[PDB]
Amino acid sequence: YRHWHRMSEDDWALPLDSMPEDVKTLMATPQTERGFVEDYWYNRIRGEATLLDPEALPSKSYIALARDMGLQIVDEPSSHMMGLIELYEYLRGASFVGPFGTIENPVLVPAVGQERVVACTGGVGDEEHFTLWFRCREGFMYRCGECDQIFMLVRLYYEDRYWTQTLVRDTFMSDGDMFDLKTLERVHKMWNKDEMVRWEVGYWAQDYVLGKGVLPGMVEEHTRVN
Amino acid sequence: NLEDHFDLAEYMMKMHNPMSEYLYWIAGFVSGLHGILPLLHSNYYFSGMFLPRDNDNTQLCDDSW
Amino acid sequence: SWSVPSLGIKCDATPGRLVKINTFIQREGVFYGQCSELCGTLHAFMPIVVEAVSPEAFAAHAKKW
Amino acid sequence: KSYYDDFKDRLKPGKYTQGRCPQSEGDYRQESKTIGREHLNDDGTRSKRYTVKEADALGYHYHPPIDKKGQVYVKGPNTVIERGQTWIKGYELPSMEYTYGPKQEDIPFYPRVKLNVWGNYNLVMKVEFLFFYLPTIIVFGICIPVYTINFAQEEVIYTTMTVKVTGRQWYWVYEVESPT
Amino acid sequence: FYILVNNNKRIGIYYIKLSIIIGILGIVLSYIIRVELYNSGNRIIKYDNVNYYNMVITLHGLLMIFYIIMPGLYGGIPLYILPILSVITDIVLPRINNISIIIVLISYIVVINSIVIEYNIGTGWTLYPPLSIIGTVIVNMILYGLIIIGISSIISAINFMNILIVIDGIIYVYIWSIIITSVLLIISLPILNGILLMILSDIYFNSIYFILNGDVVLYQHLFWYFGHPEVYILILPAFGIISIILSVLNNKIIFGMKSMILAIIMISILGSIVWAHHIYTVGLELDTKIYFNNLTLIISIPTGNKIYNWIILYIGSYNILYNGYQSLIFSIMFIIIFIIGGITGIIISIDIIDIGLHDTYYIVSHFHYILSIGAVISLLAGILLLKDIIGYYNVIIKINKYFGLLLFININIIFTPQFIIGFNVMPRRILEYSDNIIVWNLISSIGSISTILILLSIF
Amino acid sequence: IYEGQTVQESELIPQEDDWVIEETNFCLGRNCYVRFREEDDLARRALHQMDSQLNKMHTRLRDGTVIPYMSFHPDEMVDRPAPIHTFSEKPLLKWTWDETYEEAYDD
Amino acid sequence: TWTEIWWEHDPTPKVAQYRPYVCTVESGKVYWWCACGESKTQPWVDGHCKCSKREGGFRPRRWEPEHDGVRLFCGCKSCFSSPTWNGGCFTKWMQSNPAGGMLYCFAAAFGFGTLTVYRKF
Amino acid sequence: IDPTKNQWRWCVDPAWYGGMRDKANMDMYRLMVYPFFGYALLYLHSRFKQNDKYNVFAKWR
Amino acid sequence: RIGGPPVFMQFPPPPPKEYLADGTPKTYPLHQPVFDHGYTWEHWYMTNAGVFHTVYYGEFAKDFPWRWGFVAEKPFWVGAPILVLGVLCLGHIIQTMGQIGVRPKRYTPEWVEATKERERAENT
Ligand SMILES: CCCCCCCCCCCCCCCCCC(=O)OC[C@H](COP(=O)([O-])OCC(O)COP(=O)([O-])OC[C@@H](COC(=O)CCCCCCCCCCCCCCCCC)OC(=O)CCCCCCCCCCCCCCCCC)OC(=O)CCCCCCCCCCCCCCCCC
Ligand code: HEA
Ligand code: HEA
Ligand code: CUA
Ligand SMILES: [O-][O-]
Ligand SMILES: [Cu+2]
Ligand SMILES: [K+]
Ligand SMILES: [Mg+2]
Ligand SMILES: [Zn+2]
Ligand SMILES: [Zn+2]
Ligand SMILES: [Zn+2]
């Protein structure tokens, strides 16, 4: 959005030193129990394990492929929530302009709390009036006293929580078959051999499953000076 | 917290200690004294009296008092 | 500031400026004025008194004084 | 009727000047020992420790509210499903008698009326023109007089006598040509 | 905390609180002046202590202008509502806002301390040289206060200008009023600082700008190049308040919003180019005098448009609504009073009329009707409108018809007679006067004591 | 200049011959100084103040919609007295236009 | 003339009197003012006029004095400050008898002109 | 890297991001309050004495 | 922004209520006095409650001290005129206390006549 500042380096990828060292437990943790860093590396390890196995991709369904990469198959419930989330974020630093509100289609006023201050400017052209500010509280269909424009408050609330991308992913995504560490090892040997590492994440991940320091050059990789 | 919602919550909720009000009035009273006390001091310094007697810088009748 | 309200004169006596004011008195009398620019302690104690007399009277006065 | 009599009972006249006993009889300056009131004084005011000496904004009692999933507790709406539709019942504020005291009866009638606007665009535009140009005319009526009187003061006159006037602290010196 | 707070609304309260405190000292000085002027003779100041009177009038003017009305109308109400009117969480520069109020207090302490410790002499609030540069150290202290005050004013102006970058709604007329005052400060203050530094150079660095071959009239140009913009920096916030009160209380949308805004912009530009109407009697060139007189009379046009737009706001309002609220009465009283002050301003604007009326009590009454009556009442009306939002209590003002009536009557008893003595004529900045001017001076003095008594009834 | 919303004669035609203008009182009620209970502490007096806000009040019309407390300026939209942090969720100024895009509709 | 020539959807009262009614009122008491001009207990609603019966858009006008005293009340039923009187009774009379209105206005202006001219001159 | 572990950014004012170091700097300056009052009060006494304002009564006795 | 200052947070529940040992609810300081006097008037004012609403605001005598209850009970145009004169009279009295018996010589008949002589000579 225009109100956001510049992408960080982390916005693209995370450093491999932030990979959890207990990979064996990481790949067995349920999604609802994974933190932001743990969830990043669960998806990256599992997603790259399937993508770096070309011979199996054509026989893998889009439902299974999306699960491996950690992408959520969309549906009307989740689409509604995500859309209203992105609309809330956009309105943080953007103007609020849209069609005239009526009983059939009230002006939708997203909010996290139970109230949001709103102003009615009336219709277009000569039907526009001076700003009339009012407090839009949930559970009431508001009508402007001047132009009769109907307003309504929409709350991004779900089960004692507000709506977030993390909440939407946890509520609607279902964990599939438990990730098999044999796949990690098999793909690791595929792209990492004879001092050539073409899957750096899988070389670090396999090292942790082995106990940290087992694979060649990994003790030297983990030895820091400050 | 509910106590922190309102700025100056104790005063707005009518629980503040009255001493705060007394200090504010005292501060104003001291500010006022900065115009009166130097007047008295300066009058005495250059005349020997803290305040004049009306029209004592002009000729007065014999019975004037 | 040299001010004589009856003569319609109020000219500031500023250091460095020699301001010219022209006048034509029409009637005899004594016209009283006061300094009109805060000039220090005794700003209120330097009045301006101008007496206009007949030309024959002015000549006699100037000759004697 | 007298509406004050309705809520007279709630207003019990006070005993202490400024609503506090002498500090000797009860020390309101100390922090309350009641569980869950460590941030309050005995008289209910916030304690200096909570607000000044150990203010959280200064790094004391560091306790991040947001949880691991980036969530905070949010209270949901009062939802009521009905007629094949999910409804939300809004929270209505309590009767103003509870909060203010007067009994909410015999309220004078103030009808709904849309904003009182001035109409007749053509007429309004002419008035606004007059609001600006009537003063402009008056100024123009003063302009010519102002020029003339200014020119009059600064007129080269055939003066025949000079009086020099010097202003000193605090007297006026006068220099005049002496008759020959 | 108390001093550390950065909350913009708390700081707004501090500005009003400090203005009232410093205001007590201001009013006391005014009472001294009026008591002295009750008759001819010495009443409360000895003839050997006449220097104190000169200091009283000097400090009265300086404090009321820079430490009371300006901190109240440009620091108090603005810091409390402007970020709300702009639908923004808080002021753009939080830390700067805190230091500004602290600076004002510190400069006030310096001034009053200089009363107590230094010899008491005066040179007017306009600090004309050479008198200002031949005085004692009290003049040096006052200069430090003004320069320090200037720092607070400029940084506060920077703070308000930044609202344009963050405003999330519509720039209402009141917001426009503050922004333009901020612009007027940014352009006028740097010139004031320069001339004040030159006063210091002559006082403290053996400079010779204000001795022969150096033009003393130079100071008056640079001073008044800030002086007159100052009088509009003090009135424009009041105009902004009047607009909000009339629209809100009458439930009527502002009429000619764009003309109101463009009238404020116009007043500022014109107010930046008319300063020499304060220098009519020095002896300026004929064409200069005519230019300044012409442009000074033009300011009435934009100022007149605003007055008439206010009148139509009150016209036609519903009768059922109670009209005795103090805020509404004060707002209406402002229109009635400001017209008197402005019209007399136009009278003095004619230079030939000004020759008779310069340095007379007619000028006093003129700027009192606008400031001592109009600006004060506007600040009161604005605070009164925000009583619920601010939340103060323990006063009987909101609905007090006695206070409004007594104030209006008695304030006019003080300053209406000062117009009369302007054609008598009684010079300004004097304490002794001829016996034939006692009647009017006595009437005004009776008015001053009475107004003070009415200030006690609010509690 | 603003002169109200434009009305077409068709919109002024009633569906019944007995329709008149609804007589609903828009006076919110009788009020005075907010009166706190002595028993309530600082926290509970804060709740009391929050429940006495006129700008949270409205008038319900015959069709169930409510006309809220409205003001020309947002100064009257914060709790009275003003809290330390007021507009946490940015107040939304709603502008209206005739532009539309197909994605918003479904056939 | 709003009801007469501009708007035909507001109730139009009957003039009971082209002069205000003088009545003593007490603080803390509520009074009900006739808005139709057909009550026989003027200036108050009698329980039998249009206002009392809520007929034809006529309703009683609630009023309450702040202080005790004698107050003028509208008889023409059209004063802007109704129920209180502000001079609209005379104005409405002039609309109904414009020739009489001119006579009074001339007389009032004549007196005002003489007095102001005599004192200033 | 975990976004939820940086809440001290808004929970703590920037002037005290330094923990004890920043609290110490504030506390040290706090200790200088009364020394400043005595110093400032001395300046007032110095000017008051140099202007012969203490001899107001002795002058006329 | 994950882990940033939340847009909205719910208030935590208020601290436990305090009872006295006998069960009486513990009361806290309250600056809303019930002034003692014989006045019981109640003044009501229709007030702006926004754009489309009003509120009937009432002022009760018991909420004010005796001095205001006394003054506010009377009709405004009975009190106002008396108060105006009273304040003016008091001001003059105050300003006359410091000049009781002061008799400047320039206001005596002899000096008054001499000024008339000066005016005649100067045609003032
Ligand atoms: C123009 C006038 C008329 C106007 C009329 C129109 C008005 C319209 C309405 C205007 C409304 C504006 C908006 C109002 C918003 C109010 C918000 C508010 O209340 O905020 C809460 C705020 C604080 O409340 P809080 O949140 O509970 O604060 C808790 C504290 O933070 C913490 O509590 P704590 O107890 O821990 O506090 C610490 C306390 C600790 O205090 C103590 O321990 C005090 C102990 C007792 C001391 C008492 C004084 C002793 C003096 C002795 C003097 C001896 C002289 C001997 C002479 C001998 C001669 C021979 O203090 C200190 O330690 C420091 C005190 C420093 C300040 C006081 C300074 C006094 C003057 C000093 C002068 C020094 C000169 C030196 C010169 C040297 C030269 C060399 O309230 C106040 O501060 C009080 C405000 C009261 C007035 C509010 C407005 C009411 C409406 C207007 C009424 C009219 C006023 C007229 C002006 C005054 C006339 C005099
Ligand atoms: C906020 C305070 C304020 C305000 C608004 C004004 C406004 C004006 N002032 Fe000012 N003035 C002062 C404060 C103020 N002044 C002070 C404090 C001094 C003395 C400083 C000192 O010397 O120490 C002073 C001095 C002063 C003098 C010096 C006189 C002298 O030194 O002898 C003059 C003369 O030009 C002047 C003129 C004006 C004019 C022409 C206006 C205009 O703004 C007035 C405009 C308003 C109107 C004209 C009325 C409203 C408009 C209408 C009703 C439209 C119809 C009217 C017409 C068409 C004319 N002022
Ligand atoms: C805005 C500034 C201001 C204000 C309010 C006043 C108010 C008053 N002034 Fe003013 N006065 C000046 C600015 C002001 N004056 C200036 C700039 C000069 C010229 C200085 C010079 O000559 O060098 C001057 C000169 C001056 C003199 C001339 C002395 C002389 O030089 O010979 C006299 C006495 O005649 C006088 C009297 C009064 C009186 C009796 C009041 C008032 O007391 C009248 C009664 C009104 C009140 C008592 C209410 C005031 C209340 C407040 C200001 C507080 C407001 C705060 C809030 C609302 C939060 N003043
Ligand atoms: Cu010389 Cu004043
Ligand atoms: O100064 O006008
Ligand atoms: Cu000017
Ligand atoms: K005197
Ligand atoms: Mg001068
Ligand atoms: Zn609308
Ligand atoms: Zn009837
Ligand atoms: Zn009538």
Relative to the CA of E16, which ligand 3 atom is closest?
Answer: 59
In whole angstroms, what is the distance from residue A213 CA to residue A216 CA? 8
CB contact under 8 A, I8 and A112: yes
E228: Cβ below 6 Å to ligand 2? no
E458 touches chain I (CB under 8 A): no
Q: Which ligand is nearest to the CA of G86?
A: 11
DSSP string over E20-85: HHHHHHHHHHHHHHHHHTTSSS-SSS-GGGHHHHHHHHHHHHHIIIIIIIHIIIIIIHHHHHHHHH
- CA distances E251 to A170, D106, E315, F80, Å, are 51, 24, 11, 20
Q: State in Å: Cα D111 to ligand 10 middle.
A: 19
Top mutation candidate among E131, E372, E455 for ligand 3, by most atoms within 8 Å of CB? E372
Which of D3, E458, G69 has the alpha carbon at shortest distance from I43? D3
A157: phi then psi, degrees, rounded to nearest 5: -125, 135
- The strand order across the sheet containing I54-60 reads F27-31, I54-60, I42-48
Q: D28 phi and psi, to 5 degrees?
A: -80, -10
Q: Which residues of G touch I57 (CB under 8 A)?
A: none
The neighbouring-strand residues paired with A122 are A128
Question: For E317-353, b where at least 16 C-beta lie within 10 A, e where not — what string?
Answer: bbebbbbebbbbbbbbbbbebbebbbebbbebbbbbb
Q: Which residues lie below 8 Å from residue E325, measured CB to CB, with a gap of 6+?
A: E249, E384, E398, E399, I45, I47
Contact between H1 and A18 using a beta-carbon 8 Å cutoff: yes
Q: How far apart are CA E25 and CA E18, in angstroms?
A: 11
Of D20, D39, D45, the CB nearest to B10: D45
| Whether the Cβ atoms of residue A150 and residue A142 lie closer than 8 Å to each other | yes
For F64, nearest residue in chain A (alpha carbons): A141
Chains D, H: CB contacts under 8 A, how many?
Answer: 33
Q: How many A from CA of E277 to the centre of ligand 4?
A: 21
> Across the D/E interface, how many CB contacts are shorter than 8 Å?
65
User: For residue E43, what is the nearest residue in chain I, using CA coordinates?
Assistant: I98
Chain position carrying tokens 């007159």: E228
Provide residues of E within 8 Å CB-CB of chain F.
7, 9, 80-81, 84-85, 87-89, 168-170, 172, 244, 247-248, 253, 386, 388-391, 393
Expressed in angstroms and rounded, the spacing between residue E364 Cα and the centre of ligand 6 is 13
Residue E201, CA distances (Å) to B38, C40, E59 in order: 29, 21, 22
Provide the greatest CA pair distance for chain A: 78
The C-alpha atoms of residue G72 and residue G25 are separated, in whole angstroms, by 10
F70 and I7 within 8 Å at the Cβ level: the answer is: no
Burial-class residue E175 by CB neighbours within 10 Å (0-12, 13-18, 19+): buried
Tokens standing for residue G94: 């002039």
**How many CA atoms lie less than 13 Å away from A32 in the CB half-sphere?**
6
Closest among F60, F70, E403, A134 to I48, alpha carbons compared: F70
Q: Identify the burial level of G44 via C-beta atoms within 10 angstroms of its C-beta, where 0-12 means exposed, 13-18 middle and 19 or more buried.
A: buried
CA distances from I71 to E450, I58, I74, I82 (A): 18, 17, 6, 11
Task: Check whether the bond before E130 is cis (ω within 30° of 0).
Answer: yes
E228 CB under 6 A from ligand 5? yes
Q: Quick check: D167 contacting B, CB < 8 Å?
A: no
A135 backbone dihedrals φ, ψ, rounded to 5°:
-95, 115
- 8 Å CB contact between A92 and A1: yes
Chain G residue with minimal CA distance to D107?
Answer: G62
- Nearest residue by C-alpha to atom 39 in ligand 3: E30
Using CA positions, which residue lies closest to atom 1 of ligand 5? E228
Contact D67, D58 (CB under 8 A): no
By C-alpha distance, which of E146, E155, E154, E149 is closest to E199?
Answer: E146
Q: Is the Cβ of B28 closer than 8 Å to some Cβ of chain E?
A: yes
Q: Do D112 and A157 touch (CB under 8 A)?
A: no
Cβ distance C39 to D178 less than 8 Å, yes or no, reads no
Cβ separation of A134 and F100 shorter than 8 Å? no
The rounded distance, in Å, linking the Cα atoms of E231 and E274 is 12
Closest chain G CA to residue E317: G80
What sign does the dihedral E383-E389-E395-E401 (CA atoms) show? positive
SS3 G61: strand
Q: Do chains E and I touch (3 or more CB pairs under 8 A)?
A: yes
Quote the tokens at residue C45.
């104690």
Contact H59 B45 (CB under 8 A): yes
* Contact with chain B for residue H57, Cβ under 8 A: yes
Tell me the DSSP string of A17-52.
GGS-S-HHHHTTS-GGG--HHHHHHHHHHHHHHHHT
CA distance to partner chain D, nearest, from residue H55 (Å): 29
Check residue D7 and report its DSSP letter.
Answer: G
Catalytic residue list of E: 60, 90, 125, 152-153, 228, 230, 232, 243, 277-278, 303, 306, 428
Residue of F55, F58, F100 with shortest CB distance to A99: F100
* CA–CA distance, A81 with A170 (Å, rounded to integer): 13
* CA-wise closest residue to E55 among E134, E139, E140: E139
Closest-lying ligand 5 atom to the alpha carbon of residue E227: 1
CB F96 within 8 Å of CB E97: no
Ligand nearest to the CA of E62: 3
How many residues are listed for chain I in this entry? Answer: 124
Q: How far is CA D92 from CA C60, D89, E284, E300, E430, in A?
A: 101, 9, 71, 52, 66
3-state helix, strand, coil split of chain A in percent (to 5) is: 40, 20, 40
Closest CA to C18 of D164, B64, E270, E280: D164
C-alpha A145 – ligand 7 centre gap (Å)? 63
**Cis, bond preceding F81 (omega within 30 deg of 0):** yes
Is the CB of E307 inside a 6 Å radius of any atom of ligand 2?
A: yes
> What part of A 54-93 touches I (C-beta under 8 Å)?
none
d(CA A64, CA A69): 9
Query: Structure resolution in Å?
Result: 2.2
Q: Give E73's Cβ-side CA count (13 Å radius).
A: 32
User: Cis peptide before A118, with omega less than 30 degrees from 0?
Assistant: no
Strand G21-25 to G31-33 pairing = unpaired
Query: Do residues F62 and F23 touch, judged by C-beta distance below 8 A?
Result: no
Q: Which ligand is in closest contact with the Cα of E38?
A: 7
D156 to chain F, closest Cα gap in Å: 56
- In the complex, which subunits touch H with 3 or more CB pairs below 8 angstroms? A, B, D, E, I
Going by alpha carbons, the residue nearest to atom 39 of ligand 2 is: E345
Instruction: Judge B/I contact: 3 or more CB pairs < 8 A.
Output: yes
Breaks (C-N over 2.5 A) in chain I follow: none
Tokens encoding E193:
């600082």
Task: Sort out which chain F residues have CB atoms less than 8 A from E82's CB and list them.
Answer: none
Which residue puts its alpha carbon closest to atom 81 of ligand 1? B20
Going by C-beta distance under 8 Å and a sequence separation of 6 or more, which residues neighbour residue E377? Answer: E330, E333, E334, E337, E407
> In this structure, which residue's CA is closest to atom 23 in ligand 3?
E124
Question: What six digits make up the tokens of E81?
Answer: 């509502």
Q: Is the CB of E227 under 6 A from ligand 3?
A: no
Q: Between chains, do B35 and E10 touch, taking CB under 8 Å as contact?
A: no
E368 lines ligand 2 (CB under 6 A): no
Contacts of A125 (CB under 8 A, 6+ apart): none
Closest CA to E399 of I100, I45, G1, A126: I45
Which residues are registered as beta bridge partners of G70?
G24
Residue type present at position F16: E
Report the alpha-carbon distance of residue E423 to residue E431 in Å, rounded.
18
Experimental method: cryo-EM
E302, burial (CB in 10 Å: exposed 0-12, middle 13-18, buried 19+): buried
For B46, what's the count of Cα atoms within 13 Å in the CB-facing half-sphere? Answer: 18
Q: What is the CA radius of gyration of chain I?
A: 32
* Contact status, residue E138 vs residue E119, Cβ threshold 8 Å: yes
Check pocket membership of B21 for ligand 1, CB cut-off 6 A: yes
Distances (CA, A) of D172 to C24, E51, E215, F14, H55: 21, 21, 22, 91, 36
For residue I61, the tally of other CB atoms under 10 A from its CB is 20
In sequence order, what are the beta bridge partners of G46?
none
Query: A113 touching I, CB under 8 A?
Result: yes
> What radius of gyration do chain A's Cα atoms show?
25
Residue I124 sits at the chain C interface (C-beta within 8 Å): yes
CA G60 – CA G35 distance, rounded (Å)? 6
Angle subtended at Cα A201 by Cα A199 and Cα A204, rounded to the nearest 5 degrees: 110
Which residues lie with the beta carbon below 6 Å from any ligand 4 atom?
A: C 35, 37-39, 43, 46; D 167
Which H or E element spans position C51? strand C47-52
Q: In the numeric block, which tokens belong to residue A10?
A: 């982390």
Q: Ligand 8: distance of its center to the CA of E126 in Å? A: 10
